[PDB]
Design an enzyme around this catalytic site. Sequence first.
Site, short mmCIF file in Angstrom:
data_model
loop_
_atom_site.label_atom_id
_atom_site.label_comp_id
_atom_site.label_asym_id
_atom_site.label_seq_id
_atom_site.Cartn_x
_atom_site.Cartn_y
_atom_site.Cartn_z
N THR A 209 0.83 -1.19 0.00
CA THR A 209 0.00 0.00 0.00
C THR A 209 0.87 1.25 0.00
OG1 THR A 209 -1.74 1.21 1.19
CG2 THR A 209 -0.12 0.01 2.53
N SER B 182 8.45 -2.69 -7.45
CA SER B 182 8.42 -2.48 -8.90
C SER B 182 9.69 -2.91 -9.64
CB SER B 182 8.10 -1.01 -9.23
OG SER B 182 9.22 -0.16 -9.00
N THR C 193 7.51 3.37 -7.86
CA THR C 193 7.97 4.45 -8.74
C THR C 193 9.12 4.05 -9.66
OG1 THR C 193 9.54 5.26 -7.08
CG2 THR C 193 7.32 6.24 -7.09
N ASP C 194 9.95 3.12 -9.21
CA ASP C 194 11.13 2.72 -9.97
C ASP C 194 10.91 2.29 -11.42
OD1 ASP C 194 12.51 3.34 -7.65
OD2 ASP C 194 12.81 1.24 -7.05
N1 LIG Z 1 11.17 0.18 -5.18
C1 LIG Z 1 10.22 1.13 -4.59
C2 LIG Z 1 9.32 0.43 -3.57
C3 LIG Z 1 8.36 -0.57 -4.20
O1 LIG Z 1 8.33 -0.70 -5.44
O2 LIG Z 1 7.63 -1.23 -3.43
C4 LIG Z 1 9.37 1.78 -5.68
O3 LIG Z 1 9.62 1.46 -6.87
O4 LIG Z 1 8.47 2.58 -5.33
#
Ligand SMILES: N[C@H](CC(=O)O)C(=O)O
Lengths: 306, 309, 307, 309
Positions: D12, D44, D77-78
């Site tokens: 979440t 991600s 976000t990655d």
């Molecule tokens: N790696 C971080 C955390 C995630 O993906 O859960 C992101 O891409 O926001």
Amino acid sequence: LPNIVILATGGTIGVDTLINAVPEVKKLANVKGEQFSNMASENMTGDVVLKLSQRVNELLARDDVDGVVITHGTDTVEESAYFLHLTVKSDKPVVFVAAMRPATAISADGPMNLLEAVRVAGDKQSRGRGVMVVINDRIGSARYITKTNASTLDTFRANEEGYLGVIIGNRIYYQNRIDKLHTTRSVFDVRGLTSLPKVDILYGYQDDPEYLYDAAIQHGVKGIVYAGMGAGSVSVRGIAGMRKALEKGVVVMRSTRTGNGIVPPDEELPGLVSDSLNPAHARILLMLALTRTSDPKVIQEYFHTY
Amino acid sequence: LPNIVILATGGTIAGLGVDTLINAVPEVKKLANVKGEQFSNMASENMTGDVVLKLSQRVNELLARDDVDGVVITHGTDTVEESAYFLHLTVKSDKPVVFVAAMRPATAISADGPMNLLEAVRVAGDKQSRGRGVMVVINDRIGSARYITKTNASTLDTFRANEEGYLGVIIGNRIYYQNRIDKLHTTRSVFDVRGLTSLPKVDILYGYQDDPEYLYDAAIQHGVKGIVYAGMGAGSVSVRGIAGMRKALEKGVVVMRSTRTGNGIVPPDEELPGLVSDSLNPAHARILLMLALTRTSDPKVIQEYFHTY
Amino acid sequence: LPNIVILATGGTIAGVDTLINAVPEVKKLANVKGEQFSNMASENMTGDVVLKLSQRVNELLARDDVDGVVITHGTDTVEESAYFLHLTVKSDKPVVFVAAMRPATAISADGPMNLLEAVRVAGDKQSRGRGVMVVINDRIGSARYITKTNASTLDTFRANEEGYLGVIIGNRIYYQNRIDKLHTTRSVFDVRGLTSLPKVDILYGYQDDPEYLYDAAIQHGVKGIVYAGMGAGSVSVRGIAGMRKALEKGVVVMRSTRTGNGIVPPDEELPGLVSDSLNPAHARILLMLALTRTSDPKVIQEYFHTY
Amino acid sequence: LPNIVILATGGTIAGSGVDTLINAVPEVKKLANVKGEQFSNMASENMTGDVVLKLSQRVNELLARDDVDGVVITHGTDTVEESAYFLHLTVKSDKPVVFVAAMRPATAISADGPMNLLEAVRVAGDKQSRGRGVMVVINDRIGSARYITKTNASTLDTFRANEEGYLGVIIGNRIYYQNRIDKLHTTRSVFDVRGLTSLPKVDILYGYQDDPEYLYDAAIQHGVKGIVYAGMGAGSVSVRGIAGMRKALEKGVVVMRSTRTGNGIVPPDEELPGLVSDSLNPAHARILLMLALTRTSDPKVIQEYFHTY
Ligand SMILES: N[C@H](CC(=O)O)C(=O)O
Ligand SMILES: N[C@H](CC(=O)O)C(=O)O
Ligand SMILES: N[C@H](CC(=O)O)C(=O)O
Ligand SMILES: N[C@H](CC(=O)O)C(=O)O
């Protein structure tokens, strides 16, 4: 080859001198120069910009004209461009072009800027995109583009809106189409006008003087654009000044001095809100809005759609 | 822990007392020994030079004490660049002076004030933060009062110095200092304001197509000592503006040509009237011109000030 | 008039004598002397050649008759060459890299003005002790922060978060910042007696990134791997397996970011070191140099937080 | 109220599953009748093509329903720019598909997740949001999947499209649409992926001084169908890179030259091997190349896809 008319108004960038200076243009289209005026852009006036619009309108009405490139000074090109953006009733390309370095300077940008402006104006894909400002390999919408730096070549930018397109390797890459009303779908017709309602701009800052509002009111302004602190925030002195302006039928439009962003509606403050229009752009639209109405609700809608 | 005084002046960061502000973010108490103090309470658009002058003198006093290692000043975002730059030139100390603000109200979803305040205190309490001039901390960034400015009317990332960048950033609870401003400030400034109770009046007139000459007349007629011009392009002036500036110059008013563009250098030009603002935008230019006027009326000296501060 | 030596290496900006005679206005800013160090597109610039360039520049700057140097270079890898010298030139005399985004024969070619500004910057006494600089498009960028952010525009060189050290407008230099990092005279990276550099490769981070590329790098003897990671150096299950195999084989792993800007923070739950705000290209240059002095993770990590 | 389905792919982004998210930000229920679905749960950086494929197929499925007006996808976000662009090219619906993310953890001070989600739902349910291609909403901005990218490793304002700007912004609970992308997508895309379970393999190789030829050899040996080159400058290639690309082309591998710079156009160049990525950065280029390969291996056709999608 498309037929392109190059209208010169002046600027750091005769019209034939410029055409002869860059022979390359002939290979992009059949160019015909026309000296509309010759003055620094800081001296361009609404009355003259009005004639410019009317002249461009009649040129574009001709079957023998496919597009127009307008050489202009960089200082107020955003104002003149946005004006025609709202008043030219045609889908044919209207491209403003300028130069940050004088034609005699080393590595002058004028030559390449002009070449790009003509390519843009002569491309069939450039139709129906609103008025454009071409310079430094970029194509900016008249509604968003603005001179952000006092002296750099890359001064024209639309930080939040980006460019409509770019010109790289002699090829045009279109990125966006503006989501606002313009040109052929604009309700602002001025062909039957010789002048526009007077609108002045007052700055927002600590200790801003109330008397400047009085002065503007007394000199007949029909509108006042406020380059406010933050999101059009007003000091107690600015509020008192705006109150007097409103009591006398003057339309007050709150913009921002920050340079970018949305000035949101706030029923607790006087006047209208400029949406994402900066001061210079807001003044232009307000002047045109005043030629059609004085109804604040109608004016406010114009600012959210144009 | 370092002793940090938090001076509250108002702003969206409390749109609330300074104590409720600290309690909302107990984490600051782990970074330093904070002491809350309500200096004033008003929206930054109503912040006035006389009050800013008092704020500066108060900060000067506090930083003169050995039991005070730094100060954090909560302030509205709208004019924080004006107040911050004022103190940048008037606070005679190398101890950290950090202005902090918030673009979202304290009661808003995902309010930025809490983290902004935590970062500001961290910056103020870090011994590595000394001698960097006044700073404005917000959205993980540390901007110099001389360069930072509110560039967007409503975004969280509104504070930027496009050409000058940030002095540093705060990521993962760690400070990363990137630059040191190459300008005079604080302990190296000649702008002593001790004892003063008011400053010379300076107005800002906008530059645009059809800009009226009567605005200059009005300002001149109301006793301004200086006029900052937010000009078209590189401080370019229309015929009406030229006429207006001449009248001002004849009446002994100092004219400073800045730019409405938002960034950049307004270069010297002997063919135009007045002085040039270097890279100072209109708001900062007004602040420096006011302070310059407390010490001189000589165009030469004032111009050098603008090229060094 | 200061004595400025112009070293040409190649680049769209243009041999060195043609460049000088092409822009005679330079001889009014200083007493210029040209030297053709090399001639190749910057995409072919190699560490061994950059190493020799740095040694030559040190040699040149040690002379009393030399006040500064201007190095013409291609725009593609100038950030790599400039940062290398930023760490290895032990002198406070100005070292200014200059380049051009448009060929010297194009209309509105930017090369002439870029060169003039580079010479003016190199000859200004006010330019001393600022680290290596990259001058182009009226801007003065620090080798540590500046990077080519756009494939083809004139204004491509920018340091979004750190800004420019200064700018050149109306033939006047306006200095804005002094980088708060170690460099030149205060750097430990002395390569005077080096002839070779440790092999360091860059592997990209993306969805479905392959572990086998790490195996390949290891098999080919790399001493270090710079990871242009997803976000803040985040690693997938395949990338982490690859990094661990690299670490098991004595390779130093440095996690950077593909994003283009910002801080890759320390993370005790992830393998390898972090690159601070150094992008992949810069991180590789510093890691290569660091490896000539040590293989100590703690020391290398501190280099990345201070250089 | 519009009916919005919130599909979660990881943890979440608000409060402390998709249920926790919704219960953490009840304000969403006032903007729409929401229904949450936990599609997957991973960081991600671990999202894979096979999984993104299923995500797209699931979204297509939901949008074909009368009772679904739009979908909001919580994602890390990655790699959100990769997942978003994939759906941008494969979701055959004009209904809004809005990816939302958060740069700060849900339990962090001033976490951005709550406001981001709120804005994402408002955008997904607005009638004015139809037919704009896939969007990424975060930090008051609406970015097109084709242009938006994570530009900063750790800041809240990391998502930007420097040359293309944002499709629109959300300020004061109101959506302001600025642009419409001038490229093919969603309903006008030829990339049909229904029935597929995997995608052609495509790797990305970096361009830098001394770049090794052996990396191209390794990719070729592992059966890649395409190689995206994050080139120096405008996709410039060293002698080693050229040798590597020649070998790949000899093996029938499609080589796509992009740029490591971060922005701009990689122009056509007959003197160099492979195709050019137009304005697509490496991550986006990889996504389009994989999908292009599900249609053909013809270089001219793939090159045209890159100039129109
Ligand atoms: N790696 C971080 C955390 C995630 O993906 O859960 C992101 O891409 O926001
Ligand atoms: N004022 C300069 C020069 C001019 O207009 O002639 C400009 O606007 O470009
Ligand atoms: N005007 C807003 C609110 C305030 O000042 O209280 C600001 O400046 O942050
Ligand atoms: N590759 C181009 C051209 C060159 O290097 O000669 C550059 O880097 O500027």
